[PDB]
Structures are given as C-alpha cells and as structure tokens.
Symmetry: C3
Subunit: 289 residues, 3 copies
C-alpha cells in the first residue's frame, strides 16, 4: 500500500533590517508531500519506507526533488529504522514546545548542532553516504529513543565521527518529563549535548514548562527556556522567555497565537526577539491534506 500526505503553508515573514537592499517582509511558503509505502503481514510485523518532496520559497532552481529514503520494521511497540532516520535528540517530547507562529519557530529551541531527519537533498555531497539506525520503544506513557548516525558509512569506522543519541519521555494527564543526551552531536568531536525538560498541564486549557539544555561546543553555552500556552475555545495563546550563557546576550522572548479555523486548517502568528536583539514576526496559514 502507498499513501500520500502533507501540508501547504503560506504567509508573511518579517525580519527587522534583513540586509542592505533586501525587503524586510517576504511571502514565505512551503509545500511538503510525504510518500509512504507499507507492507503489513499476518505475523504482526509491519515494513515501511518513506520519501519526502519538500519545496520552500527561495529553493535553488525553483524545483523540488525527493530526499534520501528511510526504512522501518515495527513489531509490538518496537520500531527499528534505517537510512535517513529520526534521531533521539530531535524526537523526544517537550523540546520544541515553545515554538509558535505559522513556521513553528522559537529562539527558545536548543542552540546546538545535531543530526536530524533530512527533509531535502544536499547539493554539497556531504550526505551521500550518510546512514543511521534508530530504535524506538513505546511502552505505555513511556517512550525510549536510541539513534546512531554514521555520516559516511563507506569509509573505515575509526576515521569518521559517529553520533550516538539516547532519550526518554514520560507523561500522565498532568505532568510530563523528558531528557536526552547525544555524544559527538552533528559528527563534531566532543560536541556533547543534553536536555532535560518538564511541563505541567495546570488545567484542561493551559500548560507551563521549562526546558534546560547543555549546548555542547556551541557559543551559546547552557540555556533555559520557560514557556506557556493557553487555549480559549479555538484560539491558543503562546509565550516564552529564554536565556543563554553567552556573554552579553539579551533575553529572548516571544508571544504568538493560533486560531483553529477548521479541522486541518490553522492560522498562526508571532512576534519574537532574539539573543542579539533581532526582531522577527510572522502571520500565515497551514492546511493539512
């Protein structure tokens, strides 16, 4: 069986004083199509393969292509994936929950470098022999994630830096906890990064959380992000504040809102301020199909 799914989004993206001779406000948009092939068996083992075709405004050649494939095998809550895999630091819960606006962005996201699923081709040639293995285990309320990425699998193993990641999250109706650790993140020797977060659903309607990171070799140093969101019917209001250890950095913050226009159609906007005083804003729509 083959299924197709995806989303389109478009809106306005503003970056205060973007550059000499550049418009500060542009129309930013994205089309994402996922192609998933799955083979179910009566033994209960499912096999799957996925390809993505994603276009973003500004993409070279005004064209769209597929990325590198991902393959998986699932059985009894356990999933093993190979190729262009989802990594542990990128898949744990809570770590991206301060994002807002129609492009799901936040200065409060981790300021470190690490491997993650590659949505597109890479013209530099750097990903040509990139290969990962990931294992996930979902055991009710608990999620475990393990990932191993070799950026160049054809070359002798001791000549390249491989990334090893581990993560777990846990939740009930009111509290959630999550932690992750990755050594040689992004294939950079000694770039060891870590995350610990927690969130409290202080209602049926609100949530408040705190994420802490060790950003490894990044110049940002350690980081803390405090965020919250509250739903009033179809409208959701979001906010965050984030601090990094880099000398002289400003406190980053953001405020945004979402409006659920219909099932699968969401209008979102945000106004945010960065660690170097950058001001960014956006307003747009995303529709899922």
């Amino acid at each position: 069986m083959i299924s197709l799914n995806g989303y389109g989004r478009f809106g306005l993206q503003y970056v205060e004083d973007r550059g000499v001779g550049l418009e500060d406000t542009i129309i930013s948009s994205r089309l994402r199509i996922n192609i998933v092939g799955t083979t179910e068996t009566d033994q209960g083992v499912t096999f799957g393969a996925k390809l993505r075709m994603q276009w973003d405004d500004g993409d070279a050649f005004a064209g769209t292509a597929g990325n590198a494939a991902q393959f998986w095998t699932s059985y009894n809550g356990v999933t093993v994936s190979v190729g262009n895999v989802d990594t542990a630091f990128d898949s744990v819960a809570l770590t991206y929950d301060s994002e807002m606006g129609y492009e799901w962005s936040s200065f409060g996201d981790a300021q470190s470098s690490f491997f993650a699923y590659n949505s597109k081709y890479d013209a530099s040639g750097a990903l040509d022999n990139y290969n990962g293995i990931a294992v996930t285990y979902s055991i009710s309320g608990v999620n475990l994630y393990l990932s191993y990425v070799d950026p160049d699998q054809t070359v002798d193993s001791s000549l390249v830096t491989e990334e090893f990641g581990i993560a777990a999250d846990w939740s009930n109706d009111m509290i959630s906890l999550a932690a992750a650790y990755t050594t040689d993140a992004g294939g950079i020797v000694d770039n060891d990064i870590a995350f610990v977060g927690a969130a409290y659903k202080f209602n049926d309607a609100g949530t408040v959380g705190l994420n802490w990171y060790d950003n490894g070799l990044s110049t940002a140093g350690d980081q803390v992000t405090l965020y919250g969101n509250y739903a009033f019917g179809a409208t959701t209001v979001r906010a965050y504040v984030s601090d990094i250890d880099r000398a002289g950095a400003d406190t980053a913050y953001g405020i945004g809102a979402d409006y659920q226009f219909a099932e699968g159609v969401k209008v979102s906007g945000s106004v945010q301020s960065g660690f170097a005083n950058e001001t960014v804003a956006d307003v747009g729509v995303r529709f899922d199909f």
Copy 2:
C-alpha cells in the same frame, strides 16, 4: 486529500531543414503529472496546493523533477493564489484557440514575452525568488483575472520590474469576447502588451474567431489571427491565418485535424507555415489519465 492527474502524448514532429546534421523528423513526447493537495472546510473555504512533474523529450539529464509550488484559497467564486501562479494574459479565454496538432501549437498565438505558470525547474537560477499573487473571480458567464508577479521578491521592490496583468472574458451560447492587458510583461520595462478577441459559434458544430494583439517590445509588432474550426462527428478540422507587422514577414497559416478516438484519447495532426517561411508538421496521440 491528495489527487494525481495528468497526460501522456507522443508522435512525430517535423521541422523542415531543422539544422546541419540534424534529423528533420523526431519522436516528440511529454509526460505530465499534477499532484494536488486540497483541504475542504465546513465554512466553504477550500485550501489547495499543487506541484507538477513534467518530462519532455530532450530534457537535460534524462530526468524529471517537480516545479515550484502554487497555493490557493477559494471561497464563493473568488480564488486567491500565491507562488507559481497562473497569470492573467495566459489564463483569459480565446487567446490560444487557434492552436492545433498534438502539441497544441500555432504561429497565430501572441508573439510577445510574458510570465506564465512555470511547468518545470529553471537551472539558470532566475526563478529562485520568483513569487506571484493572482486573483480570479468567476461571476456567471464572466471571468475576471488579475495577476502580479515579482521576479525576485527578496530584493527591494524599487530595484526590480514587477509584472501587473488584468483580463476578462465573457460568453453566452453564441458569442465570446475577451481582452487582456499586462504592463512590464515578462519583467521587461515598457513591454506593455494587449489582447482583444471575439468568437462566434456559427452553429452547434463550427466556430470562427479573430484575435488581435499589441506585442509590446517584440519585433513582431501588432498581430491579427483569424481562425476557425468545425466538428463532423468525432473529427474536428481546424485552420488559421495570422499576420504580424514586422517588415517583410510572410503570412502564417495552418491546417489540422483532431480525432476523438475515445473519452480522454485524442489523435491530432497539423501542417503549419511560419512568419519566416518555416514549415512544421506533426501527428500524434494524447491520452488523459
């Protein structure tokens, strides 16, 4: 929801004395696939996104890729589209009705340069930040079209030439009228082009029309195309004559026929003569799927 549609065509394409050491007759063919994602809402607003994958004989690398995305929102007869849009001069009725043969070609089509939906990627890099907005309004028998294209939306607005177009058409059972005007067509300063056309369905079976153009900065100058077609059961016969103002040009003309082999399968052929005496012919099949 995601749907796929398209067409394949193949046949013989003859160009008298095509070039030293070249075959005059080749097998010309095209595969077009459209991928359309749509999200309908109970409020009556539809959201859509489309991508095209088109291959033509001769394409570089013997490969096929997607083009840049188009997004739209429709409500009550009004459609707003963004990104790789259909433009007013290219979407009005009548302007391409002298086309014939299995590749829908005619020297009687406008001999001007203007933006239109881009079916493929562009390796020159020229379309990378190209972005348009279009608005169409279909109000029974009447169609209005407006389009605005900025060929490089990231650069300051006064540093690039944007194309603005407007058009309308109108029809009843027997007469049709259409007009279009576009300033700085193709992003070329002062290339202002215009079209006015009319057609008469002088039966249930025949139609005769006349299109007039102002080709802006093109060397062709003003142009007039007179065409007609007549259906005899499954067979359609077509003809046209066209004249341009360029000094010394020949009168262009063409004669062709279509045969409706089955629903979605059409066999077509034509013999045509250009403004510089070029002789071209074709015969082939198109099938829609």
Copy 3:
C-alpha cells in the same frame, strides 16, 4: 487512472577487501516507486505512461528524482512502447534466473554491455536524446520481443550507432527455452551479442537450467552458466556455477537462499565468488507495496 507501486529493501552487503580505508561491509538499501498512468478505452486499446523514482544508498546529493518517461499502447496481446523502453535482451525469460541474494545479483548473468530500461536520470548528459521503440507479442506460451534504440535521435541517423534486438521465449509446464540476439549492443559498433538458454522443472519444487552467451566485444568472451533452485516450503535454495573464456579466469559460483516471510516480504542472502576471485556476500529483506 494513476497507480503507484514499488518496493523497499535493506540489508548488509559485504565485499571482501573493498578498498584501502573502506569498510568491507555496508548497509545497502533501495527505495523504488513506479508511477503508472493508464487510459483504458471501450475499443480495447489501452494507453499507458510510466515514471520511476528510485533511490540507492550512495546516490549523489542524497536525493531522488524521476527518470525519463516510457509510453505504450496495447491491443490484443500486442504492445508497442516508445521512449525509455524495455529492450529485447533484457526482457527475455531465463537470462537472469541464476540471480540470488536480496539484491538479485549473479556473476552468472551475461558479461556484455547492452541497453536496458534506465531506472534513473544520467548526469553525464549521455541519455538526453535517447529514444527507443519496442514491440512485444505474447501469443500463449510464446513471447516475442523486438527493440530498436537510437541513443541520440536528434542527430542524423547515419552518424550514430543504433541498437537492434530480437528475442523469444517459450514454455510449457516442464521445459522452457529462450534465445536473444542484439546487434551493436549498447550503441557499440560490432558488439553483437547472443543468448540461448533452457530450463527443466524437474519437479513441482526444483528447476535446473543452462544459459550460454556470446558476449560480443567484452573481454569475457563466451560464457556458460549452470544453475538450479529448490523450494522446501517457504525456503528456496539456489546455486550456480559460471565459466567465461577469458584467459586465466576462475570459475564463478554462488549459493544462496530465500525465505518467504509473508506475501510480499522476502528475506534473502547469498555468498558468491567471482571470475577474479572476488568474494561477495549479502543478507537482507525486500518488501513490496
């Protein structure tokens, strides 16, 4: 109508002493998606078009694209195809039946150069004007194949070498015979190649066959491959031995097995030895979707 089908495969591929500083064992995988558009008519003539998107580990840019299109028309057992066609030497029965392992490989396959369907784009530009015509006729038990490939159809016909192929196979419940001949195979003047094979289903469970080739200008010279396979319930065991005329070559051989895990899911592995003493092994899974 548009349908999608394909397969994913992944596993381990070992090549003894692959190269200085290279891993001998890698994770080799492939994702293949076929997109087929078909138009059926009440006259009984079917029209079709197909595109393939295939990714293999190691592919340049870590991306996937479509290949060049193939078009066909079928009526009463006869199929005419144009564009990126299947060729006679590549489509006859028996010629690849010694293959084994999850990548369907065998040193006992013909060691000659010839055109075949191109699964991917070609960055060299060599296939840009490549165009073939093929005709197949399936007349109960009998299959005839004819193919003509012009590697550069736009250039004068006497300036390029075209490949012409013919083949036939025939089978009943127990015996199968097949033969093929291709002149100027691969567009190489005087590279004339030929195949003759036969197989005997010495049970409901086993088969033994012998293929002979004339490899044209290849340095391998003539070749003979003897192979067999036997099914024990869900498990199939395969073997082959092959000899070429090249001076000093070793006898190539291979032994493998397949396990039918479920409909559409097959686990396969093989250990093989080449004409230059290369040792190769593989174990993996293929799943069809």
